Every structure is written in structure tokens, then in C-alpha cells.
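Suppose you are handed only these lines of text.
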Amino acid sequence: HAKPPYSYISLITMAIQQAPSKMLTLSEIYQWIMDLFPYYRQNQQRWQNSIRHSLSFNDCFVKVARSPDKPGKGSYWTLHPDSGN
Amino acid sequence: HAKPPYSYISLITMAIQQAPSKMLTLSEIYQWIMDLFPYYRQNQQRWQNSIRHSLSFNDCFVKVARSPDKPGKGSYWTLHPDSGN
DNA sequence: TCGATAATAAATATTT
DNA sequence: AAATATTTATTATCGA
Ligand SMILES: [Mg+2]
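From them, the structure of the protein bound to magnesium ion can be written out as follows.
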């Protein structure tokens, strides 16, 4: 397919918004984007770099530590309170 | 009632995509945006100008004339095939 | 970080 | 008397 119009901030925001408890890991963000948008099933090394960049660079995305029981790869990412949600 | 992250291109694309006929008039685009995003119920004079600019400036949006037997203000807008979706 | 794209703000232009 | 459509420049923001 062709590239959808969504910015990386928009792609991440939509992924978080539909996520159980409005939290998901980086790899879950990757998977949601690829599941919904066939364009992103390729050039993964490039756009996933852009995803990681967008999560860190923008204050609207906030890191949340894993639980001590069921800890794992990466933290959860969520939306900052003074966005819309 | 906070500003959603979506670009004007993304807002228009989403509005058209959800239309039963896959086409919307300009005023229908305005209404869909305002219905879904309360933020856009203000400053309509500004962002609706931006909507019109985005519709004309981008080739992914293509104008479709009303039938001669059903005239009115403005044409229908839809997504062009030569732009993916 | 640097190159690309979006968006704000107009005047202009078309049409009902 | 208006909604709609096109166009240009500039500022802001995005993204490779
Ligand atoms: Mg967007």
C-alpha cells in the first residue's frame, strides 16, 4: 500500500489510545502500526528509528516502568495528562 | 476539547474514508471534523481556511462535480487513486 | 541535525 | 452576498 498521511505523533497516539489501559511497549507500537498500515511492513529499520525518536523527543509521550513481577523488554509508553485524554 | 495531533491532510482523509460514498462536500468535511473533535468548534474562520488550502494544494484530493440535476454550493471531494488510497 | 513538509495568513478567483 | 476554490509567501513543525 501507499504511505498513510499520519504523522509519527499521530500514529503513536492512535496506538496508545486503543491499547488496553492506554499503555503499550515500543514493540507493541511497531506491531500495531504494521498490523493496520501495510506500507510500514517494509523499511522497518528506518521508520522504527523515527518512532523511537518521536517517543523520546516529544513530551506528550511518557515512559512508564514495568511491574517488578512481569518485568520485561522496554517500558510502557503512554500519553501525558495535559494532552486530550 | 484539546487539539488532536492530526494534520489537515489526515483529518480530510479520515472524513472522506468514513463517508458511505467515499466522497464529501466541503461543509460535510467541516461538520465531521467538528462533530468528532470539539477543539475545532472554535476559530472556524482560521482552520476552515486551512482545510480549503489543503484540499486544493494537495493532489491526493480531487474535486468531483455535482450532478446537473442536483446543483448546490461546492463539489464533492474524494481521494485520488494515483495517490494510493 | 539538516532537509522536507505542514500551516498560517492572505489576496485572488470561481461559482450559486 | 456568500460559500467555495486557487494561489503565494512565510513561519512553524516534522522526519530521515
Ligand atoms: Mg497526522
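What can we learn from it? The helical segments of chain B are 8-17, 26-36, 44-57. DSSP finds three helices and three strands in chain B.
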